[PDB]
Amino acid sequence: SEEAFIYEAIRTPRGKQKNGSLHEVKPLSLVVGLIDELRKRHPDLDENLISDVILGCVSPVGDQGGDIARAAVLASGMPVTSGGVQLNRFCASGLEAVNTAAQKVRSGWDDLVLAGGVESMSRVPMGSDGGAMGLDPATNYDVMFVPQSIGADLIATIEGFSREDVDAYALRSQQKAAEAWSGGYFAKSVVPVRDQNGLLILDHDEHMRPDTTKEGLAKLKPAFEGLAALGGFDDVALQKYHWVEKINHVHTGGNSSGIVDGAALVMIGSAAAGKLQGLTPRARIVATATSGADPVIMLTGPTPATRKVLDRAGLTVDDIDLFELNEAFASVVLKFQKDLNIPDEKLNVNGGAIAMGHPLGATGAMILGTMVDELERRNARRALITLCIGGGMGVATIIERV
Amino acid sequence: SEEAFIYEAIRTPRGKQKNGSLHEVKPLSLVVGLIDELRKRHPDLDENLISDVILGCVSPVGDQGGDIARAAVLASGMPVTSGGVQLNRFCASGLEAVNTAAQKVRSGWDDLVLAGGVESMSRVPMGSDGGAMGLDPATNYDVMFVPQSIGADLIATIEGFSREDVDAYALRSQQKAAEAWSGGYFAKSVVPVRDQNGLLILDHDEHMRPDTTKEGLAKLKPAFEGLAALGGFDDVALQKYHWVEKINHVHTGGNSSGIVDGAALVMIGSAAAGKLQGLTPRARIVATATSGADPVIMLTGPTPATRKVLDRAGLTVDDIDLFELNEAFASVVLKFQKDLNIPDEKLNVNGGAIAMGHPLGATGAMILGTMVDELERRNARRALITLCIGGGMGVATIIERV
Amino acid sequence: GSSHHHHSMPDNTIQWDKDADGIVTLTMDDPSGSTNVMNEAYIESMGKAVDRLVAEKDSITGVVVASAKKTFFAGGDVKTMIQARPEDAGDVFNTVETIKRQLRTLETLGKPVVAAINGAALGGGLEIALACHHRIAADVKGSQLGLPEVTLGLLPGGGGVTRTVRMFGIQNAFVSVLAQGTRFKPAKAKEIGLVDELVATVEELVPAAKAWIKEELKANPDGAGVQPWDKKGYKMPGGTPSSPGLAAILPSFPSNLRKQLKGAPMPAPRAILAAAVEGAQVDFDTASRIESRYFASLVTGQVAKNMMQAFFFDLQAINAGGSRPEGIGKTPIKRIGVLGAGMMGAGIAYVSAKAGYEVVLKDVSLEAAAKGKGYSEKLEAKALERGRTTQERSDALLARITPTADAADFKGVDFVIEAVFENQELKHKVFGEIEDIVEPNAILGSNTSTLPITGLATGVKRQEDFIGIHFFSPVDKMPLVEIIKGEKTSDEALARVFDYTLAIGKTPIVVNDSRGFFTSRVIGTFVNEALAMLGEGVEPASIEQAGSQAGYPAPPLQLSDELNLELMHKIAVATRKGVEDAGGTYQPHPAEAVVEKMIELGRSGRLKGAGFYEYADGKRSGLWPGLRETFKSGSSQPPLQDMIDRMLFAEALETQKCLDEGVLTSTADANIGSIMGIGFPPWTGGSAQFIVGYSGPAGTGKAAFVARARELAAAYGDRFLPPESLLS
Numbered sequence A, B: 001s002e003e004a005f006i007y008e009a010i011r012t013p014r015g016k017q018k019n020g021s022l023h024e025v026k027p028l029s030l031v032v033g034l035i036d037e038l039r040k041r042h043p044d045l046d047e048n049l050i051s052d053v054i055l056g057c058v059s060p061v062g063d064q065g066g067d068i069a070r071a072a073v074l075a076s077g078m079p080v081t082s083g084g085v086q087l088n089r090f091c092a093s094g095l096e097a098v099n100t101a102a103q104k105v106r107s108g109w110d111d112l113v114l115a116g117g118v119e120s121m122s123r124v125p126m127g128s129d130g131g132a133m134g135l136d137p138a139t140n141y142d143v144m145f146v147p148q149s150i151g152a153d154l155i156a157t158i159e160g161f162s163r164e165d166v167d168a169y170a171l172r173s174q175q176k177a178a179e180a181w182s183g184g185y186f187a188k189s190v191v192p193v194r195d196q197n198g199l200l201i202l203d204h205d206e207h208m209r210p211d212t213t214k215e216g217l218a219k220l221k222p223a224f225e226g227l228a229a230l231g232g233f234d235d236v237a238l239q240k241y242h243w244v245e246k247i248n249h250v251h252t253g254g255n256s257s258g259i260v261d262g263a264a265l266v267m268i269g270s271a272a273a274g275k276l277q278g279l280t281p282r283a284r285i286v287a288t289a290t291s292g293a294d295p296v297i298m299l300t301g302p303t304p305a306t307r308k309v310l311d312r313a314g315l316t317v318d319d320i321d322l323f324e325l326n327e328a329f330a331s332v333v334l335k336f337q338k339d340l341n342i343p344d345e346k347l348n349v350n351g352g353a354i355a356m357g358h359p360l361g362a363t364g365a366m367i368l369g370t371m372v373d374e375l376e377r378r379n380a381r382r383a384l385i386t387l388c389i390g391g392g393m394g395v396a397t398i399i400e401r402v
Numbered sequence C: 001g002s003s004h005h006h007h008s009m010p011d012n013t014i015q016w017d018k019d020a021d022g023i024v025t026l027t028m029d030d031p032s033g034s035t036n037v038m039n040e041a042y043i044e045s046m047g048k049a050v051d052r053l054v055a056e057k058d059s060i061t062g063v064v065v066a067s068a069k070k071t072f073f074a075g076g077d078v079k080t081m082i083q084a085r086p087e088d089a090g091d092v093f094n095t096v097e098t099i100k101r102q103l104r105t106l107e108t109l110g111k112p113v114v115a116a117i118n119g120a121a122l123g124g125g126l127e128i129a130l131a132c133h134h135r136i137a138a139d140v141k142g143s144q145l146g147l148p149e150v151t152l153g154l155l156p157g158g159g160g161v162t163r164t165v166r167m168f169g170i171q172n173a174f175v176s177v178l179a180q181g182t183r184f185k186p187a188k189a190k191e192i193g194l195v196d197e198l199v200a201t202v203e204e205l206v207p208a209a210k211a212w213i214k215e216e217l218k219a220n221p222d223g224a225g226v227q228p229w230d231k232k233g234y235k236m237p238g239g240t241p242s243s244p245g246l247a248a249i250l251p252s253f254p255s256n257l258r259k260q261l262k263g264a265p266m267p268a269p270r271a272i273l274a275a276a277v278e279g280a281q282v283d284f285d286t287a288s289r290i291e292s293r294y295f296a297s298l299v300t301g302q303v304a305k306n307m308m309q310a311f312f313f314d315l316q317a318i319n320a321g322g323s324r325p326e327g328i329g330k331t332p333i334k335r336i337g338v339l340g341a342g343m344m345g346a347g348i349a350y351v352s353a354k355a356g357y358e359v360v361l362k363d364v365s366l367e368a369a370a371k372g373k374g375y376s377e378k379l380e381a382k383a384l385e386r387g388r389t390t391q392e393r394s395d396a397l398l399a400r401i402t403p404t405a406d407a408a409d410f411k412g413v414d415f416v417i418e419a420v421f422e423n424q425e426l427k428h429k430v431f432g433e434i435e436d437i438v439e440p441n442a443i444l445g446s447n448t449s450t451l452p453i454t455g456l457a458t459g460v461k462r463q464e465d466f467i468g469i470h471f472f473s474p475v476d477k478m479p480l481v482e483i484i485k486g487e488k489t490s491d492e493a494l495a496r497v498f499d500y501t502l503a504i505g506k507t508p509i510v511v512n513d514s515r516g517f518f519t520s521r522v523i524g525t526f527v528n529e530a531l532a533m534l535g536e537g538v539e540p541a542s543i544e545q546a547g548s549q550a551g552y553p554a555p556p557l558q559l560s561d562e563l564n565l566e567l568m569h570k571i572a573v574a575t576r577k578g579v580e581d582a583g584g585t586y587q588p589h590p591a592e593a594v595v596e597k598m599i600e601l602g603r604s605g606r607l608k609g610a611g612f613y614e615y616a617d618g619k620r621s622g623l624w625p626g627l628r629e630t631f632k633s634g635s636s637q638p639p640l641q642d643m644i645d646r647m648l649f650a651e652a653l654e655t656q657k658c659l660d661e662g663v664l665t666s667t668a669d670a671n672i673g674s675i676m677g678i679g680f681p682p683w684t685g686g687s688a689q690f691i692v693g694y695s696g697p698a699g700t701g702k703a704a705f706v707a708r709a710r711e712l713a714a715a716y717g718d719r720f721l722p723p724e725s726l727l728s
């Protein structure tokens, strides 16, 4: 019934893992800063109309525990009636928060909702929350748990992606991120992080290496950090993918997503809510879909979710102007492009997480806001946003410029 | 747009905190046991039509980390396309999961959803996840954080509820829970927990004290375990509620909700999803609402949330046959009853969390399933379900028997 | 449950003695056997003793747990555990819960309890000792300590998992103690902390135990009788699962376990790891009850019954002479003469020497027979440096062997074992020049793998004493001997070879003369099914994965490279001629075409240097890339479970044929012969036990096996049709 519109979409710059500028900043402060930016852009908005704040967060412990969405409501001085709920759907948590917000608006029982995500991976590392799929032996053994990087190496092995193929995509991601920054494509949506005194902490994506060359990417060593360096996971993967004899380990730190800190916020509402508060809609949520694929390969969820959201919207690949898929690993994007025959010039046109980083809970909201801006900048019509997820899940969203 | 119907609603028995029967049971197993019970009741249901599994969990840590909803999908052998997302909105997480499931169905973008919650408080105690409001002294200092128990004592002080008043409600809750169990009201919704060999572990709510007396409740000491036992929280509360001179500490372990382990599951779908699978609808979700109130008193959120859902559904208090409010504290229920003039015979008619326990993330779905059964048993029509929440939040839902 | 008792009660097992100092000595002495065993009698006996320890608590100062047998305590009641049905899960659970309540009460009595370990303490025996506060072991020869329950498909359910995890942490307890059932000598047991102190003789045990009790009471009054995990401040070695250091590596424990088992369907190691980690998350008593539930699931499962049937009942029916002829006395063996230098002939000489027999190694020349004795020589050149030198015994062993190159040195031989090239004319000859120089009662044994024993017998005058004696390389490590009766082989000759097999510490099976015997014939169907799948276009990687995940020690294509494909071609040609000679016709197996395609490509195995795998510097280094183009790999993609079942069912059906044709006379020989001879997966209990123990979608039992075999027959061929003997 009610249509869901995007009125604002902003994000912080992404701070890097080691000696990063955002390490001293509580993840709660990253969200409050974006709330203050929304207030700056609409100082007469009646925040009592905002009925919920929905934040994705993959490691909701420590600084990110205790429903950080409600903490952001209280700490920012928003009305006590504004709710606040944390959710976790691994890498797609940020987009799931936006989709849940859009569905609350469509249901007619909510009018104006804040949605996004926050992840301070330098302060709350991945896995800090534990979990059963990894730590409980009986179920770990049964589901054949394998780290993401090994599934991505398996994809490259099965599809025939060489080390040079994944490094070529990584170079292209670095170049398009540098061109987008230098061209001013991100000037309106990246909100610099500042301290309690107004001093600048960070105003750009620290993880980027614009001078990346193909020769530098070739010198990098295959991934060996954390769980993957531990033994057995190659054999577990090949016990299920039994027709593959040996896994070609092509992924490194240079063609995999960066570990970064960041947050993102999206304001979603009905037409009546926007008319009432004098808000101009930037885009419309056309359709959403959740699906999945094999959790041992773990990164092939994007393809069924993308087909499902195209079918639900009555669209085909040719009707989409921009495709935005999170760059968790280079082979995941190359597989996605190969399966759906995505033209090269439509895919991740402003660079991706390989160059700028993948702040787990916030990434989905970040790349959605990226597409809202690039549609408006190109005067293009439709964009499709999707992410691969741990556990073999997939989430996809289609937006239409307004 | 589309109507959302409840097709099944089950729960585990609630095991007690000290020497409880469920202490040896992984919270993941509590959820899997309920999924298997749904399979027994509908062996021919095509599980590929289930697009998501939404679980509330307030302490998503350790045994409850790593998106337990996805773990439940994979461990139970459900299709990998069935998603799985964890969310946290404190005490309303179980009801929020059901509401999000209903709103996903109403948006037309999902068809059949499992919703519920899980909390093993004997294995993962409250606060195990940390919290951005208790580990950020700047935030704590500004929001004037106060434990829920002091807010409940403050409600008793402001409203004139005596120790005998709140103890009289606690006795009433023990009696009605005992009558419900004796009358077989719960025989078909409480699913006994069993081990991997089929051996019984628990088949009743072992926190109940059916032989409670008014004299026994009078002997208990005011609550002085946890954060409240520490210093300063009375003074913080009265710095805001400055017209109150002294707080009357009336709440004990006998008139407050119990610490228990448990899980609950609800199957929610559209009418088309039910027809296609041969499912009988049991109730319709009429409306939901999310509001809140002052976070220092922290437990008066259910009052505007109930008015908001009544106004949204175009109904009044007279139209509701059964009121179900979570018995976090006795004074919270007495204020809700006084503020809205609720008849006694309509309020928490089968007992509540004082007698049977309050397993945080699952409670919202437990008392929802309780009202579905009692509406069918009484042949009544409308029930309203609401819960108070930490941080001063409120959630409410109206269902109609079908 | 809240009692130390579970259910003409059984007879008492424990003797009670309270000395003047208040120290109670519990001596375990089951009158119904030579070994204390965790049976109903023990449970009722320990229940009475523990009841008394609590009732008389005010006059008791300490406890000593001792044994009057040669061993301390070893094993459980397998007769009972093998009968436990899934409907008996409650009874199994109640039993181990009762056993652990007794041990827990003993452990929390408020006074020190010492275990006086005089001999072997295995399984439930070590679990008794772990419930004590101090362990003293006598460092006597033959004593072992360990928890070998996993080797029977069970787990240490009497507290062994919970207590060793509390003592050593999750990683050390699982890897070194629980997952493989490792047995430790008393010296090594003290080093790793399983035992606290050692004494030289068994007579010092109880005095040393009572002395330690006296000193513990004087020097540690508050901590006397308090285990480390019952004190405030207990820290688990290596941390708990919620500890950040252990949480980082914990997700890799199941994957490393899958890597070691290669995906085989053995449920016991998975259950041990689950019980260990889950138990480390909760208090001791809760951890103990979790252990009981995983124990019950193993006992009431089928794999544990397979392994108990094979490694307990079947192996002891064989060692008790089930296949040995009845009513035949023993005959001494004075000199043994081996007719061949080589990997077989040399290994036979060593195993005969170590048993206490003099051996004469004959060959075509003494410079070649010296190379034969060089094999036992290098075997001793290894045993010496590993700290396992029998010194004069080893030199006497090598001195026992005596190369020669002339028949004159076989003078006093009354037991001949030939090991020469497979050629009747050669064999018929090499027995002729030796037949008259040996003793009049000598046994003429042949170690052939193809030629018929009845046909080889015609080359000698005493055909009643000609017999097949089939060894497996390496002879020093392979524990099976396949004895083959010729048509004219006498029962006396069979009984004497049977006794010789036991004397050299190996396991005999008795096979009647038939093409392929039992081991070579059954393993052929395993290899041929794999080669068939390769010729059908199945991916080579899937075939090797199916072999490993089925539980075989070597995947079948790797095994084909080591059996040599040319030798497989010869067995095919010989089987042809013989079938054609007797008037029959030979339906060629599809594997023969795969064998021929590899030979004409110059890829015939590991010795050739190129087979299904590539070989560099002798080691195996990946599948041959040209394999997929040669056989159109990928054109056929059956489910992995179909490939697994095709290999197991082919061997199980060929085993049933051998039993129906009288090639074998007992399923014990079939099971042990398949497990120990050709490497049939131990989780099955043997190629014959696999039929009664099959479990899958169709169910469990012989009927489920029949249904699955028919399902395989429809999809892949009538060689999977079950025989009449398996049908109702």
Ligand SMILES: O=C(O)c1cnn(Cc2ccccc2)c1
Binding pocket: B230, B231
């Ligand atoms: O209630 C307790 O447990 C407690 C412990 N220390 N204090 C005093 C304190 C005040 C301000 C900052 C730090 C400590 C109170």
Ligand SMILES: O=C(O)c1cnn(Cc2ccccc2)c1
Binding pocket: C038, C075, C076, C077, C080, C081, C092, C095, C096, C099, C123, C124, C127, C149, C154, C155, C156, C157, C158, C159, C299
């Ligand atoms: O830990 C061991 O190895 C063990 C062996 N037997 N038992 C006792 C037992 C006997 C029969 C049925 C259930 C349990 C424990």
Ligand SMILES: O=C(O)c1cnn(Cc2ccccc2)c1
Binding pocket: C168, C172, C173, C176, C177, C192, C193
């Ligand atoms: O294999 C060996 O010789 C060995 C020696 N020490 N460890 C570590 C260990 C510690 C505690 C309990 C078991 C093992 C293994």
Ligand SMILES: O=C(O)c1cnn(Cc2ccccc2)c1
Binding pocket: A230, A231, C171, C174, C175, C249, C252, C253, C254, C256, C257
């Ligand atoms: O990843 C590690 O750090 C590691 C250390 N030891 N292991 C071997 C092991 C296998 C199975 C169960 C427990 C331990 C793995």
Ligand SMILES: O=C(O)c1cnn(Cc2ccccc2)c1
Binding pocket: C175, C179, C180, C256, C257, C260, C261, C269
């Ligand atoms: O049954 C076997 O073959 C087997 C082999 N290893 N294990 C246990 C183990 C696992 C991981 C690391 C060390 C030991 C059991």
Ligand SMILES: O=C(O)c1cnn(Cc2ccccc2)c1
Binding pocket: C264, C265, C266, C267, C268, C270, C297, C298, C300, C301, C302, C303, C304
């Ligand atoms: O005999 C039994 O009780 C049994 C139970 N499960 N399985 C198969 C299995 C083996 C290893 C790991 C996972 C499953 C056999």
Ligand SMILES: O=C(O)c1cnn(Cc2ccccc2)c1
Binding pocket: C449, C516, C520, C521, C523, C524, C525, C527, C528, C563, C567, C568, C571, C572, C575, C589
């Ligand atoms: O095709 C057959 O009939 C067949 C029988 N055994 N084999 C393999 C084998 C090779 C060398 C020695 C022993 C066995 C193949």
